[PDB]
Amino acid sequence: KKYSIGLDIGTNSVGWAVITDEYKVPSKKFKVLGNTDRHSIKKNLIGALLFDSGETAERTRLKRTARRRYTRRKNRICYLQEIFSNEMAKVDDSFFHRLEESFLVEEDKKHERHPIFGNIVDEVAYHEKYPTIYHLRKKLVDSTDKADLRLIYLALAHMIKFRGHFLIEGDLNPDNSDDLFLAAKNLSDAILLSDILRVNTEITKAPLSASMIKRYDEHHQDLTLLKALVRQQLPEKYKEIFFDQSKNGYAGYIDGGASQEEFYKFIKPILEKMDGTEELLVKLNREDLLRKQRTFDNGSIPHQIHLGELHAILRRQEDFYPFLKDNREKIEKILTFRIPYYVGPLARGNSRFAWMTRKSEETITPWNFEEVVDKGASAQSFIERMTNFDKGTYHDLLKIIKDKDFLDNEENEDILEDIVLTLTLFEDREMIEERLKTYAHLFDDKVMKQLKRRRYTGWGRDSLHEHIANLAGSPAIKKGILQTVKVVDELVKVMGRHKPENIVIELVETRQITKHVAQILDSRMVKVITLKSKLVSDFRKDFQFYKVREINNYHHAHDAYLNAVVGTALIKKIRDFATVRKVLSMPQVNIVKKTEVQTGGFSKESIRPKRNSDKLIARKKDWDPKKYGGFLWPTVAYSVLVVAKVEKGKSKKLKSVKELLGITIMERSSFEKNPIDFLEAKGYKEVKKDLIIKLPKYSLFELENGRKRMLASAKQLQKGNELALPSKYVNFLYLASHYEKLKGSPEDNEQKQLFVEQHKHYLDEIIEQISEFSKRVILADANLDKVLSAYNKHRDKPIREQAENIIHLFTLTRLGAPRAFKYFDTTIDPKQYRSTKEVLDATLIHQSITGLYETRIDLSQLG
RNA sequence: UAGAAAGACGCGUUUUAGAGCUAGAAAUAGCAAGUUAAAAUAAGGCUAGUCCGUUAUCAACUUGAAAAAGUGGCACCGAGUCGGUGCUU
DNA sequence: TTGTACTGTAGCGTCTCA
DNA sequence: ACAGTACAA
């Protein structure tokens, strides 16, 4: 009539147990549903839940921020094109069209394949005249001659597509340098520009283009010297270095994927043993030898350099094109504008992150930003929304008031709370002034213009899904909480809604968890015990109950049992203690890997080159991956068992087939919108609508002779069986190791040290046990012959290392995916179950959250 | 020691553009050149925003657009992953 | 033409704020 | 986990 529940809480596992007063685990007969022969199974009330670790939201946050970055950059270029469109339609209406179609292949383009000029000779002449865009930028800054609008748009679009960082708040004009306050400020500008820019010998308003043009010319002359020198000294490696793109040469540096430092470390011995390269070595040691222009170290350039160059070109070209003079400040705004950090996304109430408030409901652009956005309300909403609700100044403001008695004034101190509220919340000078506006008449101008600098820091301290969705903490650590609440719900469900007298659970987080599960007694209709792990740890050492975590997953459920037993024993206090030995040795433990649908990214993110394979994913709707390339390795959401007719053969025949097919994550929406039509799109005919079965990852299949296999994907399986050793074997395998810390005392505990050699033969029987279980459910032959041979050739080694590598040997047997393991001195290579045909006639198992209730679907009776 | 949200930057990848020349029946061989740009950066979605799209939730079966609710006897002896016995309606 | 065995492939660095 | 090459039918 009385039962207790032991719970072990972890990132991946929730061990559960049902304990009676003699510490017995009851064994009860459960109705099993489904079309199979059985209608009753017998299973023990002890088990473990296994699931994948939960994911933190950091990756999703970075991906969302990158998405917003690309969206706003494309919007910047769209603004610039919108400005230039009226004038540029007069000369080349198709110019922007060719720019957007530059990605397409020659037959797919709606205009000529040369984007900038639309004809071969002009494009070749432009590339010869300006080898890079930086040559064009320097030419437009320096020369006062009229320029074509295509070239000016190219320079400006390169300016604002890649505008550089915003870590500088002043002006930082690039021509300032390479009354002590102003001299010190300008010399600070000089030291930062010397960190950014190397040298400018002949003065120009475009020092970045000058320095990188020097970089390009130096690279050209040094490559010419390298070609001549390698031809004159080492003709056999010329083919290697300047043609082979795979051997990390200069050809690998340019055409291949070699970065700067690997190319340097490859070329350095080459320029060391051959002579005449002292300048080349000293340039390599400066990391200035054959540099590119677009380089990883360009993150240091402030946006003010690009802004100065852009201002220079528009001052040069305003008289030729008065259209630029009409809206010069607009293009300068497009470079210099940035969404404020406190505003947030510019939504219209549709985001789940946005908090901004707008005044006048026009579309927000660079130019009307400060007159449409209520900066005050948005800025205070930034700071109020993430500060938690509730569960010195006596000597400091004396300076500002210049009086202590008026600091001790009592009547008007609510607004005095509210000024320090303002300067604890806000930071911006104008915006602190705008929220400080309220108190203007109480004080003369100098004292609040001094007082606004007084920055303050610090702060003084239903449905179940929505009842947990409001909780604090990371989304990764909460998964065990949701699963444990659901396991408790089912364990009270199983026994006619009889509450347990005591449940025992596994620092500050679990102190909060104890209260959160304690609120259930009045929120959701159970003496919860906050058991410390140390008590179970020394108790498990005080007796024979050693664990070796490398063997199997049963020790989760065993730890749940130990939790329940120690908790009920504890509450009962500078036949039962006889029962515990039997209950540890039980071979049947309900272990459930949680069937969960994979959610996440479409595939591995690297875009593969063009290939003739049909497994490349189209990275855009029109972009056929035969020609354009695309992604590989899509993530499957879940498998789907489908029975249908498929025509096969040149003389096609409507042959019936049963197989499972994988739904990838982006096909999931289209499949669940209309399953049959998606399946017919895949080539299946007369699909049986009601016979379709959804199969998530870790779907469990039971096969003949008790073999269980777990489903990893539509094309891959996992081992789904666990071996249980007798506890004596586990005790030998534990006590064969840890000699420097096992005994704890030097001579009384010696029988633990002596225990292993008088039972060395257990290791031989454990060998036969592993072999019998591998002919049972692993069915690996060659790997078994390998491990038997390796055991026979090393069986006389000292006992500690033998037992440690016997512990290593259980990777062959452990639940989950097969993996390589070293044993003594040889890698036993794993095997991969790429054969899902064997489960299309097996017994599909649907397991409840505890795994007690089951549903058995015999697939061979379908179709 | 780590959790959530916002604003940015620089690379990288992919396709195209940057006329390769000479000897060539050709296979290929010698020679020249290489640094840059455009576009995309989850397919896309509709509430069409300079917004949203990788976090969280998810056995089966019956209702419910969904939300959400409901659906499976006991005692004993054994233990190769659970087996059987008897009582019960 | 359809399954098995063996080997290879897999986005990232750096900020600023309350 | 999936892709690609290399073979057994």
Side-chain angles (χ1 to χ4, degrees):
Chain A
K1 263 282 189 173
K2 314 272 151 283
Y3 71 92
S4 306
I5 295 172
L7 283 158
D8 165 287
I9 310 274
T11 88
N12 289 50
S13 60
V14 181
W16 71 260
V18 190
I19 269 45
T20 69
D21 35 26
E22 311 87 3
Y23 316 142
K24 264 193 201 53
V25 171
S27 64
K28 294 194 173 190
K29 308 175 84 168
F30 293 92
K31 182 86 174 193
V32 305
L33 303 176
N35 68 353
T36 195
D37 299 350
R38 294 214 73 84
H39 336 286
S40 151
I41 203 92
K42 176 112 189 179
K43 293 187 297 181
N44 299 312
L45 308 193
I46 185 172
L49 172 65
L50 278 289
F51 45 88
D52 293 344
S53 197
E55 294 191 17
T56 206
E58 201 190 35
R59 172 180 161 80
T60 320
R61 167 157 30 87
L62 320 168
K63 289 295 186 182
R64 180 174 57 249
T65 288
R67 274 201 300 271
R68 274 195 274 259
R69 274 201 51 260
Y70 297 130
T71 326
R72 300 187 178 119
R73 178 163 85 195
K74 174 57 182 199
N75 278 314
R76 295 205 289 269
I77 308 287
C78 199
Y79 291 134
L80 213 167
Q81 298 197 5
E82 163 57 37
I83 301 148
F84 269 143
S85 51
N86 282 334
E87 298 304 320
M88 181 81 83
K90 214 172 311 173
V91 297
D92 302 11
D93 51 355
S94 64
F95 188 79
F96 298 121
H97 215 176
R98 294 197 306 275
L99 284 150
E100 83 175 286
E101 297 168 351
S102 77
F103 195 89
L104 303 180
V105 301
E106 182 184 7
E107 82 217 16
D108 283 350
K109 297 177 158 91
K110 311 181 143 12
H111 304 286
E112 281 304 5
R113 69 203 181 101
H114 293 100
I116 297 176
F117 287 97
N119 68 293
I120 174 71
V121 53
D122 282 285
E123 189 107 347
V124 166
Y126 151 82
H127 280 98
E128 157 277 341
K129 194 72 161 33
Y130 311 99
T132 79
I133 191 62
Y134 285 19
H135 288 97
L136 178 53
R137 272 160 50 148
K138 187 174 185 292
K139 177 260 180 175
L140 296 176
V141 173
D142 285 342
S143 88
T144 194
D145 189 3
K146 180 171 181 180
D148 183 306
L149 231 49
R150 296 171 287 193
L151 295 192
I152 311 176
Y153 166 67
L154 255 295
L156 292 183
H158 192 266
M159 221 75 88
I160 317 151
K161 192 167 182 174
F162 316 98
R163 86 179 159 247
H165 72 69
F166 268 73
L167 285 310
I168 287 312
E169 306 216 304
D171 281 10
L172 207 30
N173 62 286
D175 58 337
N176 85 84
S177 61
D178 67 348
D179 297 341
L180 279 302
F181 45 90
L182 186 68
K185 202 48 55 184
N186 281 268
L187 164 153
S188 207
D189 310 352
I191 77 169
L192 324 161
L193 265 58
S194 34
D195 313 330
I196 301 146
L197 307 179
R198 303 294 73 71
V199 186
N200 63 103
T201 58
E202 189 294 344
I203 187 62
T204 170
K205 307 304 190 186
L208 186 80
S209 304
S211 76
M212 292 265 198
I213 270 176
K214 151 177 169 284
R215 214 191 271 201
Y216 168 74
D217 293 342
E218 169 272 2
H219 179 303
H220 187 320
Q221 86 194 9
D222 268 316
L223 160 64
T224 292
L225 156 62
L226 219 32
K227 280 187 181 189
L229 181 93
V230 152
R231 283 199 173 287
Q232 83 164 100
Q233 293 195 34
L234 297 171
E236 76 283 38
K237 320 198 74 58
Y238 177 81
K239 185 68 172 186
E240 181 95 338
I241 295 173
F242 301 144
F243 291 90
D244 180 5
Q245 318 171 359
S246 100
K247 266 270 189 207
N248 189 256
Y250 174 79
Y253 178 61
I254 302 307
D255 302 304
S259 59
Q260 184 190 267
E261 51 76 21
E262 331 175 2
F263 163 66
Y264 283 0
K265 92 175 288 188
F266 159 75
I267 271 287
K268 193 176 188 278
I270 317 303
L271 308 185
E272 274 167 0
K273 75 197 78 65
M274 77 195 273
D275 74 3
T277 59
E278 281 70 359
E279 318 86 11
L280 292 203
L281 268 289
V282 75
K283 264 202 271 213
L284 191 147
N285 291 341
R286 289 197 299 96
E287 284 43 49
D288 201 9
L289 159 62
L290 320 167
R291 308 216 86 197
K292 296 170 188 167
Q293 305 42 57
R294 307 308 302 282
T295 324
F296 65 119
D297 79 42
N298 289 11
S300 299
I301 328 189
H303 70 281
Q304 289 95 342
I305 294 171
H306 286 273
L307 180 32
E309 288 188 3
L310 191 166
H311 180 232
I313 314 156
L314 301 154
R315 293 251 81 81
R316 287 287 194 219
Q317 297 284 324
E318 52 185 29
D319 69 347
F320 305 113
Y321 298 93
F323 148 77
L324 316 174
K325 194 153 161 313
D326 303 318
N327 48 357
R328 200 197 85 258
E329 291 57 13
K330 285 185 69 180
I331 318 150
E332 289 204 16
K333 189 56 175 177
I334 312 174
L335 202 166
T336 204
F337 177 61
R338 185 166 62 105
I339 303 293
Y341 72 101
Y342 50 63
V343 161
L346 295 186
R348 199 185 278 176
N350 298 327
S351 150
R352 86 177 206 74
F353 333 97
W355 68 78
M356 162 216 78
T357 300
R358 72 175 77 204
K359 304 198 302 177
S360 182
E361 271 66 0
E362 295 82 6
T363 49
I364 296 162
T365 67
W367 305 281
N368 44 27
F369 187 85
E370 77 285 353
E371 63 177 315
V372 173
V373 180
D374 182 346
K375 294 182 52 34
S378 320
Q380 63 149 319
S381 311
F382 171 48
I383 186 54
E384 65 60 31
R385 82 200 296 292
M386 48 43 58
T387 40
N388 78 273
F389 305 97
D390 181 40
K391 79 205 83 63
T393 305
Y394 179 90
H395 307 290
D396 195 338
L397 176 37
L398 173 58
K399 168 43 218 70
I400 308 175
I401 287 168
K402 300 284 282 288
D403 176 35
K404 214 277 297 189
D405 184 43
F406 231 77
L407 178 52
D408 288 334
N409 190 354
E410 178 70 22
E411 174 57 23
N412 60 16
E413 208 177 16
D414 87 351
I415 39 184
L416 272 159
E417 301 278 45
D418 158 78
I419 310 104
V420 56
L421 211 67
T422 296
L423 284 93
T424 317
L425 288 171
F426 303 78
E427 278 270 19
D428 169 283
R429 305 290 196 175
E430 144 62 18
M431 168 216 77
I432 292 168
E433 271 311 317
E434 201 32 62
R435 301 290 289 202
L436 188 149
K437 150 205 62 55
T438 307
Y439 330 90
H441 64 77
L442 291 101
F443 288 103
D444 65 271
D445 294 40
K446 212 290 297 298
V447 71
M448 62 318 300
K449 293 161 185 290
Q450 165 282 308
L451 151 68
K452 56 148 141 75
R453 308 173 200 158
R454 188 47 277 192
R455 172 72 188 138
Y456 291 98
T457 56
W459 287 94
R461 295 277 285 187
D462 203 0
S463 187
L464 170 62
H465 321 107
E466 282 52 87
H467 202 311
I468 304 291
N470 50 15
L471 284 190
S474 94
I477 64 184
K478 277 188 176 181
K479 189 166 187 180
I481 272 284
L482 282 292
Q483 303 328 307
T484 325
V485 168
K486 292 206 341 203
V487 166
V488 166
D489 291 339
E490 181 159 286
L491 285 176
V492 76
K493 180 177 180 287
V494 65
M495 290 206 173
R497 320 309 219 285
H498 293 37
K499 315 308 156 303
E501 87 295 329
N502 305 294
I503 82 173
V504 187
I505 39 154
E506 175 178 315
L507 178 55
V508 179
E509 292 314 322
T510 188
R511 292 274 174 79
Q512 292 201 352
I513 292 158
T514 44
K515 183 179 181 180
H516 297 163
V517 76
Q519 312 151 323
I520 287 165
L521 266 172
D522 291 338
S523 313
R524 278 181 55 70
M525 329 327 271
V526 199
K527 323 342 183 193
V528 183
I529 294 154
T530 308
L531 173 44
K532 295 186 179 74
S533 308
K534 291 183 180 180
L535 282 37
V536 158
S537 303
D538 36 31
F539 191 88
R540 226 158 190 273
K541 302 307 195 296
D542 292 348
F543 299 92
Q544 64 134 324
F545 313 143
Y546 307 109
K547 61 173 174 176
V548 160
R549 283 270 76 196
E550 316 310 323
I551 308 184
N552 65 33
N553 292 275
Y554 287 21
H555 299 287
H556 285 132
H558 297 314
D559 231 314
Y561 180 32
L562 264 291
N563 278 12
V565 82
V566 172
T568 55
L570 168 153
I571 68 94
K572 271 198 257 185
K573 281 189 177 184
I574 196 95
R575 299 186 294 235
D576 53 0
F577 61 79
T579 299
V580 71
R581 281 83 179 164
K582 178 191 331 151
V583 153
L584 258 291
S585 193
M586 301 183 17
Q588 194 273 326
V589 169
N590 311 289
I591 287 198
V592 179
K593 195 71 150 69
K594 204 183 91 83
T595 55
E596 55 197 332
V597 172
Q598 302 299 102
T599 53
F602 206 169
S603 66
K604 295 288 164 69
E605 310 183 11
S606 96
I607 301 141
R608 313 309 289 181
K610 71 193 296 190
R611 274 211 51 240
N612 229 292
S613 155
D614 179 357
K615 307 206 308 297
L616 283 164
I617 292 165
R619 75 185 288 236
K620 204 73 97 147
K621 234 51 155 191
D622 283 328
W623 296 359
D624 167 31
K626 279 314 179 268
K627 326 189 295 192
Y628 294 110
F631 309 104
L632 286 183
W633 308 273
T635 311
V636 79
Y638 50 71
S639 303
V640 176
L641 177 66
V642 48
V643 310
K645 306 299 200 295
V646 172
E647 318 96 320
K648 185 53 211 93
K650 307 99 214 181
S651 54
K652 66 99 191 170
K653 70 215 174 310
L654 271 293
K655 147 187 209 154
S656 183
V657 67
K658 171 163 57 189
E659 59 181 22
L660 89 178
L661 166 149
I663 304 324
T664 65
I665 296 183
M666 330 279 257
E667 291 165 339
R668 188 198 185 297
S669 68
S670 34
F671 170 77
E672 301 202 50
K673 257 179 47 54
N674 197 348
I676 318 304
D677 297 350
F678 174 87
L679 290 173
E680 301 215 90
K682 299 309 299 282
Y684 298 85
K685 276 43 136 194
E686 62 175 53
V687 183
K688 301 303 300 182
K689 169 64 175 70
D690 57 347
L691 197 51
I692 295 173
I693 303 183
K694 146 152 44 163
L695 293 169
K697 191 173 185 184
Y698 319 122
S699 295
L700 185 77
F701 293 87
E702 158 85 19
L703 284 71
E704 84 305 324
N705 193 24
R707 167 137 75 76
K708 274 168 287 301
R709 287 267 189 272
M710 202 160 48
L711 185 77
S713 325
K715 302 292 173 67
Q716 174 101 39
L717 284 107
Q718 302 197 28
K719 301 166 295 180
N721 273 92
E722 321 221 54
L723 69 83
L725 302 179
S727 59
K728 53 189 172 86
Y729 291 175
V730 185
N731 298 353
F732 159 35
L733 249 68
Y734 186 69
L735 299 176
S737 195
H738 314 284
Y739 295 155
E740 56 284 296
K741 62 182 177 181
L742 173 67
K743 284 167 55 178
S745 48
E747 67 189 325
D748 52 357
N749 283 271
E750 187 66 6
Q751 84 315 339
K752 293 180 167 68
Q753 173 66 96
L754 294 168
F755 196 7
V756 289
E757 53 263 63
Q758 57 182 292
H759 291 112
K760 195 278 306 182
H761 59 81
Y762 287 0
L763 196 178
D764 292 297
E765 333 166 11
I766 281 163
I767 287 314
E768 305 185 35
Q769 193 143 70
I770 292 332
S771 61
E772 101 183 2
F773 155 99
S774 171
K775 323 291 172 33
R776 218 159 84 81
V777 317
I778 314 311
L779 45 57
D781 276 22
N783 285 57
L784 260 184
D785 308 359
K786 288 177 181 180
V787 57
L788 278 316
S789 56
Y791 180 65
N792 297 341
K793 76 192 294 184
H794 263 207
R795 79 193 305 175
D796 62 352
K797 288 286 183 181
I799 309 304
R800 188 164 181 173
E801 314 56 20
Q802 286 206 60
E804 176 68 19
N805 299 346
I806 286 284
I807 278 170
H808 278 70
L809 211 64
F810 292 166
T811 297
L812 179 61
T813 56
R814 197 182 303 113
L815 181 70
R819 296 199 298 253
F821 59 97
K822 199 58 141 193
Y823 176 26
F824 261 139
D825 56 23
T826 184
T827 62
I828 306 330
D829 298 344
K831 162 174 169 25
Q832 301 290 352
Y833 302 85
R834 158 52 201 91
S835 152
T836 75
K837 324 162 301 193
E838 56 178 322
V839 316
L840 301 174
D841 52 41
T843 307
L844 168 68
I845 312 293
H846 298 288
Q847 302 188 104
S848 55
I849 172 53
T850 57
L852 282 193
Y853 295 117
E854 283 182 21
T855 296
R856 319 280 285 204
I857 300 328
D858 184 353
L859 301 203
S860 76
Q861 287 134 28
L862 318 181

